[PDB]
Write a protein that binds this ligand. Structure first.
Ligand SMILES: CC(C)CCC[C@@H](C)[C@H]1CC[C@H]2[C@@H]3CC=C4C[C@@H](O)CC[C@]4(C)[C@H]3CC[C@]12C
Lengths: 50, 221, 335, 219, 295, 219
């Protein structure tokens, strides 16, 4: 029980951010690298290894 | 393109090796050992890290036995690896009715054995895997019944304090705890101190299992 | 005394998480246009296994992959030409995991024997030989990934995860805190943190050097079977046995979006992402593989080629291909 | 080609026996059968048998039953027909024609008589070879001729001036006498404008005896 | 010598009934064999020891079935296909007929090995089904079609062509009929009746459900084979006997026995339809494989 | 068996006009499988019968389209559309459905011509036959039409019958006419006892019965 109390203390004294900020960051990352993603946009058979 | 043809030849060679290895593996017999009370690993090992594999050959047939009593983790997370074994060998101590579990006195130990047998026999993976039942410690049980009547374990038991009748009753109860009567069979044997006879029954049971599997495969039913 | 304080500490954490819940991900990702219905067809079909397949891994060159099966074989394939480059026979045939080192020199294996084996591929004579055997765990090994050419991290069923050292062969650090068996593990892209989901329906973020658990995420109903990081390393997605998938964020420190459907009643065995983080792939018990959408939670494709349960799945580093292996003893490559 | 060739003409005595052959060619012999048909002079055609040329299953006419036997020779591809106990009524012309179809499983007789070999003439009489006697015809436009009586056997070809005249010539078919030998006549007509200056002669040819008789005819 | 017996045929019995039976058999057999071949070829798991025998038998049955429309057309009006097909049809018919009966004997041997000697007989079955099938099924079948090449050719009469094996004298017919019966009934019959009987002698006294289920299927197989192939060979035998003159009962007897042979050969043609039902669609494993191959 | 009769026994033809030969059977010529196996033959003199049409209607290859057949049941016939000089000879119809096969009576297809008077000649016997011991005289009839000719011998105005032979020549290729011969053969005793000899000729084209006579010594 002593370890659980000590463990909880460390995990509670950290800084949080709003959900909207993380969601916007994920959306920005998805948009930025969407140009080079063979699965989203199929590559023409000229450069397709398979 | 010498490298391409060399690679194709190497692929063909190590592909031909796999077929031979697979044939040799499919020619063998694999058994799984289980036990509830005393870990069920005492008699079988001597008569002949986590999982212990034992090999022996009897009458031009290669047997293996996997002992999973050292895997004290959650059983539903790794029991699906053993689907497809030829048979399951189960150990029950007959001289366990009058005793109680070490952790608590509320539960009789042989009721725990019945519970484990119910869990194993009616599991969803083992619908066609036949079960070989060994009832161990027949001498101690025969000595024990006379001093202590068999009524502490079965309140519904009504009969003489005789070894043969009590043994038949216990065997009937364990065999009646089965549900899939049309897809698997349960073989019962009372372990004997002559190991040759004890290892002849396993051979006969596995031969019967093999014959039924061949019937299913060959299309006769 | 300690029990009462622990409940109070957890209450403040829950209150803090609720305050940060400004707007859910779907509301602000409503504007983006949905991706077209993804339809991938099998390119190759690798065969030669004679039993179930329980794991696989992709090389860092996007060409060579290693697969572990119950027949007692560990095969390195070549995805381009289907040729087998190696076939390493295991000492124990109950294997549940494999890994293929970033350098390409080594592989790994594990299973019910509680022992991790590191094999050396590029030997002097050209023959694959065991380079080390790692023992010390008290439960079945479930996953193992290479940090680098000399260090490897493993997670077992004894509710522990540990960091090893191949040359000296002893446990260097041990991460404890879980309640049930640890079933999966995933390394960060920067290889400084990793997370593992356990059987207690919870996931934790560890530190390879500090050795202390930093964060804990809850919300699942049953066993967690798979896990993986989002490509930029700020998020990870978990799939559990109760027929659901969930996405967490480390900075926001709570759940964002749940991918579920009413028709799905079977659990998930493996998940993986795409190169840009737009296609959360998942493997399902009902012989199917579903392609999700990390931002809109709308199914965009189905991969139905296997006659038995799908148990492993992975995506190449360049994003060119995705390979699935199932209990029918066949591997397939989609593109 | 698909054709059938038979024997030659022959003269016999009453009570004797005859055999004629029908050599076939140009077709698979062992897939059909051979039927033997006769035709009496001045009387309708009639049938007297069948044979198989394959497992030899012969059948015979009711009237000629017991007096005729048929055999075939598969090696030389020919069929025979043996007849015995000949009367004077047997004078006819015997023909040979393919008839019926055979085989392992198909075996019929409703397939028509197509090839129809040329056929041989058969005669029966109680006599031997005699020489013909030729006499000129003395008349009183005028005609002239030669008379042949009491000769045997058929035929005899009469030529006028050894074939020097082929205008207004008539040859009369021979007729059987009651005695048992043939007799015929041939008459040619030439206008009597110059009857006395011209002369006419006959050159008869009795092939079985090599007899040639020359007669000059005057009134 | 003796009189001549000429065949006589009924217009209806040869014109309306035989074509319908031939068409029904053609359709049913082609559907069944097509389904079996597609299921066997489209499965991806492996080729079990008995999955390599169903394919031989399906191929032989398909070759037999393809022959039927030509016989139906011949029975309706006449032969229009020339002289080359009058040989090709006979060759195909003979090959398929002999192979489709030798494969049954090999399947019976396979099953007897797989049940009676269960523990140790894993090698001989593979050797049989991978090497000896070609030596013992297809080679003799091919070598027994020399008479079809030689003695079969169409012949012309009036305006009707007949396609039949034309033999020089009666003896060839008898020799080839005795060879036909000896190779088509006696050789596989004893093997089937000697293996399945000693299988059901061992699957009888057991009280299990699966053994009791397999006993009925084996008995069904034994009865089906003989009840399908026996009357035709009885007719062939009593025809060969009268061709030797050892039976003399007039000509109406010969016409009657020929009618019996003609009516029972069509019944014997149902083997190409009863084989897929008995050997493929009565098995649980094959049913599961077919359900998998449906998707 | 099955008896077949065909009519007319004779049938004269003019060129370009149809001719019809009809034969009807005793029973119904239908087999169990149907069809009707009756076929027609033509036998040009000095040859063998040649198939013309089979199965009542089909015509075998190589036969001129002029010949045609029709009918069914137990009454049917053969008809020629256009007749030329190469349609002269006997015709027969044969059935092959029952066992055995049978042939028709036969119809001679003569060629018709305008009626012409006959030229009558008399050739008295010569001396060589008389010294031999046989006397024979002939009453020549030449280049006439049709076959109808009643010729009887008149000796001493008495009718003699039973001792005369007749011969008739076939159609003339150039004119289609006939030629009959009547021979009166008598012994020396009968010949000397009688003085006057003549033949009475009656012809359809003849207006009055012509009689040519002679006496011994004059000729
Ligand atoms: C004209 C005659 C010889 C028929 C020719 C076709 C025969 C020879 C061919 C047709 C299809 C072929 C089969 C096709 C596929 C297989 C599967 C393989 O694992 C074993 C051989 C086997 C079973 C083949 C044997 C030969 C076979 C049966």
């Amino acid at each position: 029980a002593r370890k659980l109390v000590e463990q909880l203390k460390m995990e509670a004294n950290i800084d949080r951010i709003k959900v909207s900020k993380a969601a916007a960051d994920l959306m920005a990352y998805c948009e930025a690298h969407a140009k080079e993603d063979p699965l989203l946009t199929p590559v023409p058979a000229s450069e397709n290894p398979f | 393109s010498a490298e391409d043809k060399a690679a194709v030849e190497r692929s063909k060679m190590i592909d031909r090796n796999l077929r031979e290895d697979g044939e040799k593996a499919a020619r063998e017999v694999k058994l799984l050992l289980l036990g509830a009370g005393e870990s069920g690993k005492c008699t079988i090992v001597k008569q002949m890290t986590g999982i212990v594999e034992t090999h022996f050959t009897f009458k031009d047939l290669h047997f293996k036995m996997f002992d999973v009593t050292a895997q004290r983790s959650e059983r539903k997370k790794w029991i699906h690896c053993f689907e497809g074994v030829t048979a399951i060998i189960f150990c029950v101590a007959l001289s366990d009715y009058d005793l109680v579990l070490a952790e608590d006195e509320e539960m009789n130990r042989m009721h725990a054995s019945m519970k484990l047998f119910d869990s194993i026999c009616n599991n969803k993976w083992f619908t066609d895997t036949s079960i070989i039942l060994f009832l161990n410690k027949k001498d101690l049980f025969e000595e024990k019944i006379k001093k202590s009547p068999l009524t502490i374990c079965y309140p519904e038991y009504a009969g003489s304090n005789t070894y043969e009748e009590a043994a038949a009753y216990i065997q009937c109860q364990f065999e009646d705890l089965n549900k899939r009567k049309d897809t698997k069979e349960i073989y019962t044997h009372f372990t004997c101190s002559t190991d040759t006879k004890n290892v002849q029954f396993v051979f006969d049971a596995v031969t019967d299992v093999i014959i039924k599997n061949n019937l299913k495969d060959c299309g006769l039913f | 005394q300690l029990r009462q304080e622990a409940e109070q500490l957890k209450n403040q954490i829950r209150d803090a998480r609720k305050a940060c819940a400004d707007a859910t991900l779907s509301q602000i990702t409503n504007n983006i246009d949905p991706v077209g219905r993804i339809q991938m067809r099998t390119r190759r079909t690798l065969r030669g296994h004679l039993a179930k397949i329980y794991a696989m891994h992709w090389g860092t060159d996007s060409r060579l992959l290693v697969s572990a099966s119950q027949d007692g074989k560990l095969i390195i394939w070549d995805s381009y030409t289907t040729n087998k480059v190696h076939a390493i026979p295991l000492r124990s045939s109950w294997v549940m995991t494999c890994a293929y080192a970033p350098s390409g020199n080594y592989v790994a294996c594990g299973g019910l024997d509680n022992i991790c084996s590191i094999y050396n591929l590029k030997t002097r004579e050209g023959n694959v030989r065991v380079s080390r055997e790692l023992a010390g765990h008290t439960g079945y090994l479930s996953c193992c990934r290479f940090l680098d050419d000399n260090q490897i991290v493993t997670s077992s069923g004894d509710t522990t995860c540990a960091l090893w050292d191949i040359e000296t062969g002893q446990q260097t650090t041990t991460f404890t805190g879980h309640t049930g068996d640890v079933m999966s593990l995933s390394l960060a892209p920067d290889t400084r943190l990793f997370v593992s989901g356990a059987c207690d329906a919870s996931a934790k973020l560890w530190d390879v050097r500090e050795g202390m658990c930093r964060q804990t995420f809850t919300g699942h109903e049953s066993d967690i079977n798979a896990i993986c990081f989002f490509p930029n390393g700020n998020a990870f997605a978990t799939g559990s046995d109760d027929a659901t998938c969930r996405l967490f964020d480390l900075r926001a420190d709570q759940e964002l979006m749940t991918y579920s459907h009413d028709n799905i009643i079977c659990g998930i065995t493996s998940v993986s992402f795409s190169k840009s983080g737009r296609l959360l792939l998942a493997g399902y018990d009902d012989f199917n593989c579903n392609v999700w959408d990390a931002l809109k939670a709308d199914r965009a494709g189905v991969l139905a080629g296997h006659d038995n349960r799908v148990s492993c799945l992975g995506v190449t580093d360049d994003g060119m291909a995705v390979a699935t292996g199932s209990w029918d003893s066949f591997l397939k490559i989609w593109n | 080609q698909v054709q059938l060739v038979q024997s030659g003409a022959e003269v016999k005595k009453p009570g004797a026996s005859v055999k004629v052959s029908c050599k076939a060619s140009g077709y698979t012999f062992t897939s059909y059968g051979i039927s033997w048909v006769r035709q009496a002079p001045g009387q309708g055609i009639e049938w007297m048998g069948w044979i198989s040329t394959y497992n030899g299953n012969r059948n015979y006419a009711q009237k000629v039953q017991g007096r005729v036997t048929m055999t075939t020779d598969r090696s030389t591809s020919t069929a025979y027909m043996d007849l015995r106990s000949l009367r004077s009524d047997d004078t006819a012309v015997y023909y040979c024609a393919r008839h019926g179809i055979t085989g392992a499983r198909n075996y019929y007789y409703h397939y028509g008589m197509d090839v129809w070999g040329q056929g041989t003439t058969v005669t029966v009489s109680s006599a031997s070879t005699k020489g013909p006697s030729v006499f000129p015809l003395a008349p009183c436009t005028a005609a002239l001729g030669c008379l042949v009586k009491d000769y045997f056997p058929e035929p005899v070809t009469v030529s006028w001036n050894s074939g020097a005249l082929t205008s207004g010539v008539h040859t009369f078919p021979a007729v059987l006498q009651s005695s048992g030998l043939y007799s015929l006549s041939s008459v040619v007509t030439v206008p009597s404008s110059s009857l006395g200056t011209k002369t006419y002669t006959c050159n008869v040819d009795h092939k079985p005896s090599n007899t040639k008789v020359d007669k000059r005819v005057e009134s | 010598m003796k009189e001549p017996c000429f065949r006589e045929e009924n217009a209806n019995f040869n014109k309306i009934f035989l074509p319908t039976i031939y068409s029904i058999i053609f359709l049913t057999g082609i559907v069944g064999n097509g389904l079996v071949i597609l299921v066997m070829g489209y499965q991806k798991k492996l080729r079990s020891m008995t999955d390599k025998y169903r394919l031989h038998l399906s191929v032989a049955d398909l070759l037999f079935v393809i022959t039927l429309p030509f016989w139906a057309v011949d029975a309706v009006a006449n032969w229009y296909f020339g002289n080359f097909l009058c040989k090709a049809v006979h060759v195909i018919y003979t090959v398929s007929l002999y192979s489709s009966v030798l494969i049954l004997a090999f399947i019976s041997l396979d099953r007897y090995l797989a049940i009676v000697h269960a523990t140790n007989s894993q090698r001989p079955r593979k050797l049989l089904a991978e090497k000896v099938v070609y030596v013992g099924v297809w080679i003799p079948a091919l070598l027994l079609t020399i008479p079809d090449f030689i003695f079969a050719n169409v012949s012309e009469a009036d305006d009707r062509y007949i396609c039949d094996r034309f033999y020089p004298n009666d003896l060839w017919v008898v020799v080839f009929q005795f060879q036909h019966i000896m190779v088509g009934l006696i050789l596989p019959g004893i093997v089937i009746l000697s293996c399945y009987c000693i299988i059901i002698s061992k699957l009888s006294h057991s009280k299990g459900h699966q053994k009791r289920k397999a006993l009925k299927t084996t008995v069904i197989l034994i009865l089906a084979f003989f009840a399908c192939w026996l009357p035709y060979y009885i007719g062939i035998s009593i025809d060969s006997f009268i061709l030797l003159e050892i039976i003399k009962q007039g000509c109406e007897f010969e016409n009657t026995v020929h009618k019996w042979i003609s009516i029972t050969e069509a019944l014997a043609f149902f083997h190409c339809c009863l084989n897929p039902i008995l050997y493929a669609f009565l098995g649980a494993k094959f049913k599961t494989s077919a359900q998998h191959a449906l998707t | 068996d099955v008896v077949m009769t065909q009519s007319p026994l004779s049938l004269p033809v003019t060129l370009g006009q149809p001719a019809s030969i009809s034969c009807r059977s005793s029973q119904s010529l239908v087999y169990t499988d149907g069809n009707t196996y009756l076929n027609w033959f033509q036998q040009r003199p000095g040859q063998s019968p040649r198939r013309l049409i089979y199965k009542v209607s089909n015509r075998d290859s190589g036969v001129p389209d002029r010949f045609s057949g029709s009918g069914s049941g137990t009454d049917f016939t053969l008809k020629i559309s256009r007749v030329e000089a190469e349609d002269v000879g006997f015709y027969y119809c044969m059935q092959n459905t029952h066992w055995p096969l049978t042939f028709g009576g036969g119809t001679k297809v003569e060629i018709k011509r305008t009626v012409a008077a006959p030229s009558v000649f008399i050739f008295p016997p010569s001396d060589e036959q008389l010294k031999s011991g046989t006397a024979s005289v002939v009453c020549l009839l030449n280049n006439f039409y049709p076959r109808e000719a009643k010729v009887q011998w008149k000796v001493d105005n008495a009718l003699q019958s039973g001792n005369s032979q007749e011969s008739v020549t076939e159609q003339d290729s150039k004119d289609s006419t006939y030629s009959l011969s009547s021979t009166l053969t008598l012994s020396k005793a009968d010949y000397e006892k009688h003085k006057v000899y003549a033949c009475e000729v009656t012809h359809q084209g003849l207006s009055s019965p012509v009689t040519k006579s002679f006496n011994r010594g004059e000729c």
